[PDB]
């Protein structure tokens, strides 16, 4: 069952991080009119499992590699058009295709990746797109510009529900020590130096950033739950090099700093690697653990870091001035002894309103989790990892309990008025006036419940409004309240559909 086809145009001299153009599955199934396109009309909406097959010639003397980044949503489409850094295109579920190998084909399950079956007539959420980039480039120029065809073989049977399985159900201990799609920017060894030391930071969960704008990815937030991590990481190296580049390198873990002379260094446990193949290294800590995040007055090398030394240098034949890239990917952590989780089942602060400048004020929340936009009062939000899992994932569902906390600026004996919350079905133009509470501000605490979702079952981050329950906070006399807070714990039933990164 072949449906959809596309081409990508690769210039003669590809560069590292250069943009090779994108293509979307909506265009390929619509443009390439076929059996499956019109079988996708009668079926309504489908949840396809289909294998992309990229057809390129196998040639081992240029040492190219390309990263295919699959974003269901257009977060990074605007970022990536010029000088696409590794972090933007490696923070989304991605597959590396190696030029030495040929006809790379690896399936994708659109149920486990994106979670929501898709419509035909138009697009409700932005189309699932694929971005290609040279992760590292050829040493020297090619003969002339070339091309690659990308095909996707699918079978279309009807989808029963708009929602697949939830990717993860949120709980306080959520980190089991297993990773998906964790890879790093290319480490580069230069040829001139007789020896070389390179260092990879081992403290995951530090929200990798280019230098100006941070990037939230799910692996970082998933590590940020625990306080430090265990030992014995296992990952494999991929040597992106021509056939005539060669290097052999020794891999150890270091805290805090490198022994200068080598006859002290070879005593440590470490792995030699001269080819593309796995290593397994155990994390060396004075405390047997590594914090996994950094404090205010601290650097990144002071903690544990895993180091690559070149004991026998990268050798070169007569003509190459180009550097040799090494890329590592961590499949798993093994023999885990994880420390205490950061946050227990107690509540976490969600939003806090303060500096009310105009009285008889309302604030509208609705079914959405964030994006309140209160124009007569200042608002603040939490850094917590849960609100990070809301920004990383595409669709989120559930119900979350509330509390209110406030204090009084005026004298307690001059107090008056109330803080109410109003709960409707649909927006107040029409509505059924469900359970609403009027708390007098003399009480100073209140607790209620809120639903995030729709009739469809889940609500995404970029805003639309679909019929659901609508909650608004109304303040009778505002100036009284100096500061207001609301902290929320999600009920056990919760879900996150889709996987993505949020470039902020």
């Amino acid at each position, epitope marked *: 069952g072949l449906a959809g086809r596309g081409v990508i145009y690769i210039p003669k001299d590809c560069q590292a991080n250069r943009y090779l153009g994108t293509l979307n599955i909506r265009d390929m199934i619509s443009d390439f009119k076929g059996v499956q396109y019109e079988k996708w009309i009668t079926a309504g909406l489908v949840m396809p499992t289909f294998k992309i097959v990229i057809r390129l010639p196998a040639n081992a003397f240029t040492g190219l590699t390309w990263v295919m980044s699959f974003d269901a949503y257009n977060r990074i489409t605007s970022r990536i058009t010029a000088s696409a850094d590794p972090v933007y295109t490696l923070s989304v579920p991605h597959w590396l295709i190696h030029h030495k190998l040929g006809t790379f084909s690896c399936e994708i399950d659109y149920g486990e990746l994106c979670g929501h079956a898709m419509w035909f007539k138009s697009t409700t959420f932005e189309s699932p797109r694929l971005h290609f980039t040279c992760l590292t480039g050829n040493n020297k120029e090619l003969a002339a510009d070339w091309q690659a065809v990308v095909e996707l073989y699918a079978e279309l049977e009807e989808a029963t529900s708009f929602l697949g399985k939830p990717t993860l159900v949120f709980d306080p201990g959520v980190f089991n020590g297993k990773f998906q799609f964790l890879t790093c920017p290319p480490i580069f060894f230069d040829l001139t130096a007789v020896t070389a030391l390179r260092s990879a930071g081992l403290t995951l969960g530090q*929200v990798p950033m280019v230098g*100006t*704008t*941070k990037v*939230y990815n799910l692996n970082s937030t998933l590590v940020s739950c625990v306080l430090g991590m265990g030992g014995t990481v296992r990952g494999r190296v991929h040597i992106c090099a021509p056939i005539f580049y060669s290097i052999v390198l020794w891999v150890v873990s270091e805290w805090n700093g490198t022994t200068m002379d080598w006859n002290e260094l070879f005593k440590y446990p470490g792995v030699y690697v001269e080819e593309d193949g796995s290593f397994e290294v155990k994390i060396r800590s004075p405390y047997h653990r590594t914090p996994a995040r950094l404090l205010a007055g601290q650097s990144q090398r002071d903690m544990s870091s895993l180091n690559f030394y070149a004991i026998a240098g990268p050798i070169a034949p007569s003509g190459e001035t180009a550097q040799l890239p090494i890329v590592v990917q961590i499949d798993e952590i093994v023999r885990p002894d994880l420390s205490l989780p950061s946050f227990e089942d107690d509540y976490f602060v969600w939003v806090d309103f303060s*500096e009310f*400048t105009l009285d008889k004020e309302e604030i509208e929340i609705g079914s959405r989790f*964030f*994006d*309140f*936009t*209160s*124009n007569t009062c*200042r*608002v*603040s*939000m*939490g*850094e917590n990892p849960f*609100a*990070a899992m809301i*920004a990383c994932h595409g669709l989120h569902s559930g119900v979350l309990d509330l509390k209110l906390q406030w204090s009084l600026n005026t004298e307690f004996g001059k107090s008056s008025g109330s803080v109410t919350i109003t709960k409707l079905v649909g927006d107040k133009a029409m509505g059924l006036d469900g359970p609403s509470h009027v708390f007098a501000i003399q009480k100073l605490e209140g607790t209620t419940e809120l639903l995030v979702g729709n009739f469809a079952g889940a609500n995404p981050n970029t805003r639309f409004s679909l019929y659901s329950r609508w909650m608004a906070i109304k303040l009778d006399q505002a100036k009284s309240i100096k500061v207001l807070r609301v902290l929320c714990k999600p009920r056990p039933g919760f879900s996150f559909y889709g996987r993505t990164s*949020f470039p*902020v």
Partner: nanobody, 130 residues
Framework: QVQLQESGGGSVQVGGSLRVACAAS????????AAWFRQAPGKGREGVAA????????SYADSVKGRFTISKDNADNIMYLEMNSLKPEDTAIYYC????????????????????????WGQGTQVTVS
């Protein structure tokens, strides 16, 4: 990383409007959350209005609403302070200062007015009235 050049301040009659010069981009982004600042003799660094530009969220200072505005031109894509009407006491030189390390807690919130957060500081333009 960031260059800044500004002019457009000078004496004016009450009820007057002084446009402030478009903030000079530097190093090919000019997208960072940036807030103006004021002074008073003996009193340093009180904040003024700001915009979170990419979300189109406006923030104004206390003690002022409507007589200072801050907007971004869609075509020029460069922030500039706008002042449509003016009270006698604008004594200070205004400052333009931007912060580029925005995270997730500074994004959906209102733009902060604290002085300690903004790492890029520049001279700014002199404004006063008789």
């Amino acid at each position: 990383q960031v260059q800044l050049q500004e002019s457009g301040g000078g004496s004016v009659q009450v009820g007057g409007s002084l446009r402030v010069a478009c903030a000079a981009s530097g190093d090919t982004f000019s997208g960072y959350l940036a807030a103006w600042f004021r002074q008073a003799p003996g009193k340093g660094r009180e904040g003024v209005a700001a915009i979170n530009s990419k979300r189109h969220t406006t923030s104004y200072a206390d003690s002022v609403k409507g007589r200072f505005t801050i907007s971004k031109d869609n075509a020029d894509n460069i922030m500039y302070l706008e002042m449509n009407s003016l009270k006698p006491e604008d004594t200070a030189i205004y400052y333009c200062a931007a912060a580029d390390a925005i995270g997730l807690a500074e994004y959906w919130s209102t733009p902060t007015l604290s002085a300690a957060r903004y790492k890029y500081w520049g001279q700014g333009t002199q404004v006063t009235v008789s």
